[PDB]
């Protein structure tokens, strides 16, 4: 246990698996996507890794990532999401975290696939949230010019009322996902790693931590029906934006 946690440093990889892969850092993740918006709004056939890694680098040097160890920073590198035609600009981005040390046995390739899946769902949601706050930003910028309109006041006010329900629905889910999906699960996992006195004990808690988060969100085989309902709220937000 000692030689694996010091000569190949198992723990520091977990801390950057929450910050990077579980997107739990937040500063890096918003400033990155903030700088990544004009690329993703353009279609993805003319987007390549050459433009990914460097805007990542500008984000990295700006944010808290810069202080950290070069191993975990080297092991984050970009990937293109499963390239397939259709020009879906916002969909093509992904992180591939490469583990090729002795610690590969605790970070096997099948549970990194879970990291990719939860990253995908929490890419979609954090995209939609930013669309929503752009609507809210459009309200606070434009509407002090439309006080000189006696007729558009009605329809803009109707949009104000309808928007807050979207804001609410995209802030209740997003606090359940905060404080019970990546705060309670992180804690119980941190206990079950910090005590653990077998390689098996690390692995068999890691697996079920990932599975428990799959149960908390809507990505089960039975809760596909609920996920469809949740995707139908992703329809209306891009509708209202237009």
């Amino acid at each position: 246990l000692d030689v694996l946690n010091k000569k190949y440093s198992l723990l520091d990889h977990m801390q950057a698996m929450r910050r990077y892969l579980l997107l739990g850092q937040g500063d890096f993740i918003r400033h990155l996507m903030d700088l990544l918006k004009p690329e993703l709004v353009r279609p993805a056939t003319t987007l390549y890794q050459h433009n990914l890694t460097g805007i990542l680098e500008t984000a990295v040097r700006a944010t808290n990532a810069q202080f950290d160890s070069p191993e975990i920073l080297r092991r984050l590198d970009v990937r293109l999401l499963e390239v397939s035609p259709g020009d879906t600009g916002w969909d093509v981005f992904s992180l591939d975290y490469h583990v090729d040390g002795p610690i590969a046995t605790v970070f096997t390739r099948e549970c990194m696939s879970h990291y990719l899946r939860v990253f995908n769902f929490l890419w979609r949601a954090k995209r939609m949230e930013y669309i929503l706050t752009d609507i809210r930003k459009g309200h606070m910028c434009n509407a002090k010019l439309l006080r000189n309109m006696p007729e558009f006041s009605g329809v803009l006010h109707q949009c104000h009322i309808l928007a807050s329900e979207m804001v609410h629905f995209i802030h209740q889910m997003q606090y359940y996902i905060t404080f019970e999906v990546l705060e309670c699960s992180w804690d119980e996992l941190w206990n079950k790693v910090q005590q653990a006195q077998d390689l098996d004990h690390i692995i068999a808690a890691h697996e079920v931590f990932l599975d428990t988060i799959i149960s908390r969100c809507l990505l089960d085989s039975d809760s596909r029906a609920l996920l469809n309902q949740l995707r139908a709220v992703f329809d209306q937000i891009i509708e209202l934006q237009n």
Partner: protein, 43 residues
């Protein structure tokens, strides 16, 4: 108006299936997403 109606109806349909799915985890989400009990007065 029709967009508003459509959205409220489909989120009500989400909540009604939501109530009995998992034992605790998904059950708690129902109480998170509605305090006002608007969907007891729009049931």
């Amino acid at each position: 108006r029709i967009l508003t109606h459509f959205y409220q109806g489909i989120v009500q349909q989400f909540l009604v299936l939501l109530t009995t799915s998992s034992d605790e985890s998904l059950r708690f989400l129902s109480f998170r997403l509605d305090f006002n009990e608007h969907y007891k007065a729009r049931e």
